[PDB]
Design an enzyme around this catalytic site. Structure first.
Site, PDB file in Angstrom:
ATOM      1  N   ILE A 166     -65.766  21.042 -23.774  1.00  0.00           N
ATOM      2  CA  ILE A 166     -65.928  22.102 -23.974  1.00  0.00           C
ATOM      3  C   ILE A 166     -64.642  22.978 -24.537  1.00  0.00           C
ATOM      4  CG2 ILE A 166     -64.877  22.481 -21.883  1.00  0.00           C
ATOM      5  CD1 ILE A 166     -66.726  24.045 -20.690  1.00  0.00           C
TER       6      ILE A 166
ATOM      7  N   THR B  83     -67.748  29.845 -24.799  1.00  0.00           N
ATOM      8  CA  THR B  83     -68.498  30.830 -25.048  1.00  0.00           C
ATOM      9  C   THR B  83     -69.678  30.899 -25.675  1.00  0.00           C
ATOM     10  OG1 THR B  83     -67.340  30.727 -27.122  1.00  0.00           O
ATOM     11  CG2 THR B  83     -66.510  32.076 -25.604  1.00  0.00           C
TER      12      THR B  83
ATOM     13  N   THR C  37     -69.943  25.008 -33.759  1.00  0.00           N
ATOM     14  CA  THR C  37     -71.156  25.925 -34.328  1.00  0.00           C
ATOM     15  C   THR C  37     -71.604  26.573 -35.327  1.00  0.00           C
ATOM     16  OG1 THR C  37     -69.637  27.831 -33.055  1.00  0.00           O
ATOM     17  CG2 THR C  37     -70.980  25.919 -31.596  1.00  0.00           C
TER      18      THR C  37
ATOM     19  N   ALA D 152     -69.198  28.680 -36.995  1.00  0.00           N
ATOM     20  CA  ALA D 152     -68.857  30.279 -36.412  1.00  0.00           C
ATOM     21  C   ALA D 152     -68.004  31.180 -37.985  1.00  0.00           C
ATOM     22  CB  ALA D 152     -67.849  30.283 -35.386  1.00  0.00           C
ATOM     23  N   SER D 153     -68.786  31.773 -37.438  1.00  0.00           N
ATOM     24  CA  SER D 153     -68.445  33.292 -38.672  1.00  0.00           C
ATOM     25  C   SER D 153     -67.421  33.964 -38.229  1.00  0.00           C
ATOM     26  CB  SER D 153     -70.082  33.666 -39.049  1.00  0.00           C
ATOM     27  OG  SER D 153     -70.440  34.987 -39.912  1.00  0.00           O
TER      28      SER D 153
ATOM     29  N   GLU E 195     -72.127  20.081 -32.762  1.00  0.00           N
ATOM     30  CA  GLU E 195     -72.532  20.983 -31.408  1.00  0.00           C
ATOM     31  C   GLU E 195     -72.622  19.681 -30.227  1.00  0.00           C
ATOM     32  OE1 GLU E 195     -75.684  23.333 -31.022  1.00  0.00           O
ATOM     33  OE2 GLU E 195     -75.855  24.647 -33.704  1.00  0.00           O
ATOM     34  N   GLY E 196     -71.112  19.613 -30.481  1.00  0.00           N
ATOM     35  CA  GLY E 196     -70.489  17.947 -29.606  1.00  0.00           C
ATOM     36  C   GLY E 196     -71.822  16.999 -29.315  1.00  0.00           C
TER      37      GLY E 196
ATOM     38  N   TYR F 163     -77.864  41.951 -36.825  1.00  0.00           N
ATOM     39  CA  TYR F 163     -78.507  41.273 -34.999  1.00  0.00           C
ATOM     40  C   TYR F 163     -79.747  42.274 -34.644  1.00  0.00           C
ATOM     41  CZ  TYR F 163     -75.172  38.691 -33.252  1.00  0.00           C
ATOM     42  OH  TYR F 163     -73.608  37.723 -32.782  1.00  0.00           O
TER      43      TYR F 163
END
EC number: 2.5.1.26
Lengths: 550, 552
Positions: free
Chosen positions: B151, B155, B232, B234-235, B284-285, B472
């Site tokens: 972690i 978020t 993840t 990310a962007s 993702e972990g 979105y």
């Protein structure tokens, strides 16, 4: 522009390029290129001989004789299970067990392979050549290989410079050379999304030529664009002359379809950018024919540029050139193509003292080119950089597609040469260049070479984090006991020097079987293990058995 | 700027962000943001309460009652504990530390935090401070058969942190917030060597001291970490200039059960087999712990300037965004909002058709000379689509808002308003239809599931690419008097995901997959595709130490 089934009717079976284009010594004493294919074709080059003589210390009196066609009493027998062959026939897939077609597809364009084509012969070659003409064709081939325990080596334009198509000497199964050149359609152009759905066998020349008809291009221009294919680029992570504007192949690919022993890999949608786990496109890019067959790919296109413009720059030395390119990348205002040549290369370009030369190409909107051009010259002016002229800048480019024909020329006069590349951090570029040229000069003197080698370099691409460097080295070999061993050991040494000076294994040549021995250090052991574990699930029985990488 | 071991000293345990920042009804009867952390903090929003009433049909007369801070005991092998003692690595078995790290910020979780409880929460939290610290922890977890769930910022919006109900092994929460150094800045190669725990806010703030930035700004930059980003895919808001994570990362170092993943050199671009960075990015972990990365840095932009444009409708706005992408001249950020977003954004203020028009917000950054040229090209293109400039301060307003939106969800929660956002990417020629079809689907699903007032159902285009755009959606509704409000939400969300896919859009653009979109992955990536990832998982993590069960 489409590659015919019998390749040798157009292409040299034993060298680079088209049959009708080769360098020779002319009726009137100077060197010249035959045919009408290139801007240099049929154009005499007055000072080239003198250069070669001064450079390599030879007089052109000594010519070697090479095999002019294939010695078929030196090609090994085609072993192919008789039932499989019955089944193949039902399918209608053009094939050939001919020594010619088979030997054409046993090699790419590494020096070693070009030397064997001219002098010796390969231990192992494909047993049968197949020409699928679409995806479904390929599915049938792969399923036949499973059923008949066959081995498939895919081939596209055969321009591999990494032994990536060499057949493993001890591979006992029927080797298929799965030749993609007849699977070469633009399925469609998507003008809303600005993509083309193509088949994997299309060449770069064909792809651009066709697209130019609707007013589009990809702008992906690897030096091998005449023969290299969409499927080859993906497989070897290829890089093009104008990657600055268009991107490299990882930037250019939007979607792909891939046939593996396990089934078909393709993503479900044509999104521009996703987040759905590790990107499987990247498990396939740079997989070098070890995983399956890439049949289809969707690639970004762009409207043909409005305007283009050449330029060039002179620097007081190579080092100031590198500084200038770094500053250009730092301002992120690299033009379509920017390439820094060292002095030796500058003097080479002349034939057709610490001072170096960048050549430039600009393209995009007319107004933008002129701004862009001004910015670049001002920046360079800070590093002792003076404009060397728009036409000089055209010579260096017009020249690009004929350099590869000069290796064949150099072989006729006992000179062996190869280019090899790396990428490195900005802060390593100068030291690596210096140390690698030195290392080659040394490794050469110590192995008994008379005149010191030709040893040049150029910065070919720029990035945020550093540069792509190309080296060319060549030495005349008359007198050396084993010419192939000297060169090969010197190459392998210059690699060690590259790796030790912070440079990477390859920028774009890829790995194949030439650089396998270093791969595991390059990525971690676990890194290497992970590839292994993809190989083993996708291709459990190693049907795609060229043995590149692992 | 560093996240503290006891997060609940700064951060809400039961919602987004900082304790000192929440919406509330003021002395004057107007909603306001507490504190002074955002430009909008302490500013009264006069029209906001009317908009809430008019949209969801509530008074604000009765606010829900949350839980105020159940919890399984912490069972942990003793020979392991004894050896953990020896490392000097800080750790905690405290319920409240463990409960903080059992979720990210999906509606379902935030609801379970307020009302119910997690069927499963990590058993022990550990805080390595460095790479070696993580090696030791991993070596221990293999030895003692312990599951690890990394972690960073917490978020996740994909159930990526949720502990699987039926995991009976001891779960470690391997918190990276104390491993947060810029190891060093490489001024020549323009990269930064950094630990995975550093937050976006800290990274930019630090780098700024030397005159540098990454420019990587996800809306969660205040808490999201280098490690999470890579995990993840990310962007950020200015990926147009700066790239997304996959562009930003030059090198990384990953600790896995099988050993340490790490490329031998720092070259810009290579051809050495399939790129392994890409095996880890989006992981993702599920594979190990990213401990350090090298990220590209850039000199601080010399100039920043906002702007905005108004369009007669949304279609026209989309068309303009497509043309802007066609001439490759997107400013640092460009975002087109549908009409509802316009009216929304209007209600939050300190001749076309006002029920038709859509609005783009713009951010321009770079050299002042370049900024001015760009800016002219852009308003020229928009003008051809009916587009007219609506001012810098509007544009300024648009952007600062982005950081407070996530506090508003907490607001709606306490007045029976469940809401969430979800994204996709699609090809240019699907965008308009996808927008329309997804909104319409959301309303129909709510009508059919027995919602009284019609839901908030907005969209906005948030990034442009050559081949398409990021979209979105935001959806919310009043749930007072619905038997199973969660189940109604989660069904709708699932339906709308089906619409997105049936209209040509991806599983996610940046949210990722976690456990929330697992049931579509196999079809998104081929069957063989999915099989490829399993092979990697099984090799690197034979004994499934990294057991968050994301993806597969």
């Amino acid at each position: 522009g489409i590659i015919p089934k019998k390749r040798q009717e157009l292409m040299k079976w034993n060298g680079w390029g088209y049959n009708d284009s080769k360098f020779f010594l002319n009726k009137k004493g100077q060197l010249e290129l035959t045919g009408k294919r290139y801007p240099l074709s049929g154009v005499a080059l007055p000072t080239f001989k003198d250069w070669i003589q001064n450079t390599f210390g030879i007089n052109l009196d000594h010519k070697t004789t090479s095999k002019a066609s294939l010695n078929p009493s030196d090609t090994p027998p085609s072993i192919v299970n008789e039932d499989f062959l019955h089944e193949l026939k039902k399918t209608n897939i053009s094939y050939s067990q001919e020594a010619d077609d088979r030997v054409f597809r046993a090699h790419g364009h590494c020096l070693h392979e070009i030397f064997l084509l001219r002098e010796g012969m390969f231990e192992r070659i494909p047993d049968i050549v197949l020409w699928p003409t679409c995806h479904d064709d390929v599915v049938k081939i792969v399923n036949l290989a499973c059923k008949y325990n066959l081995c498939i080596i895919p081939i596209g334009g055969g321009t591999s410079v990494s032994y990536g198509l060499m057949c493993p000497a001890d591979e006992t199964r029927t080797i298929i050379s799965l030749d993609t050149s007849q699977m070469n359609r633009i399925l469609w152009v998507d003008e809303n999304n600005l993509t083309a759905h193509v088949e994997a066998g299309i060449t770069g020349q064909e792809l651009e030529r066709q697209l130019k008809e609707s007013g589009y291009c990809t702008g992906h221009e690897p030096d091998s664009l005449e023969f290299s294919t969409v499927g080859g680029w993906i497989s070897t992570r290829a890089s093009g002359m104008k990657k600055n504007i268009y991107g490299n192949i990882e930037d250019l690919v939007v979607h792909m379809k891939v046939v593996t022993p396990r089934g078909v890999i393709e993503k479900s949608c044509q999104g521009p950018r996703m987040s759905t786990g590790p990107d499987i496109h990247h498990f396939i890019m740079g997989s070098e024919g070890t995983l399956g067959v890439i049949t289809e790919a969707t690639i970004k296109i762009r409207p043909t540029p409005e305007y283009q413009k050449y330029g060039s720059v002179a620097f007081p030395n190579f080092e100031q050139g590198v500084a200038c390119l770094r500053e250009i990348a730092k301002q992120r205002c690299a033009p379509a193509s920017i390439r820094l040549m060292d002095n030796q290369q500058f003097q080479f370009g002349h034939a057709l003292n610490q001072l170096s030369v960048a050549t430039l190409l600009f393209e995009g909107d007319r107004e933008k080119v002129l701004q862009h051009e001004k910015q670049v010259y001002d920046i360079a002016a800070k590093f002792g950089g003076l404009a060397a002229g728009e036409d000089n800048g055209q010579r260096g480019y017009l020249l690009t597609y004929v350099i590869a024909y000069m290796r064949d020329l150099g072989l006729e006069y006992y000179i062996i040469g190869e280019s090899f590349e790396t990428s490195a951090p900005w802060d390593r570029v100068v030291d690596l260049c210096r140390n690698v040229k030195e290392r080659i000069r040394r490794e050469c003197k110590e192995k008994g070479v008379q005149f010191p080698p030709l040893s040049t370099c150029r910065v070919t691409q720029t990035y945020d984090a550093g540069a792509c460097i190309y080296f060319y080295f060549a030495f005349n070999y008359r007198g050396i006991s084993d010419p192939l061993a000297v060169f090969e050991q010197t190459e392998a040494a210059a690699r060690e020097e590259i790796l030790a000076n912070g440079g990477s294994l390859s920028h774009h040549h890829g790995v194949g079987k030439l650089r396998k021995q270093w791969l595991k250090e390059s990525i971690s052991d676990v890194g290497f293990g992970m590839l292994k574990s993809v190989k083993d699930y996708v291709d459990p029985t190693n049907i795609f058995g060229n043995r590149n990488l692992l």
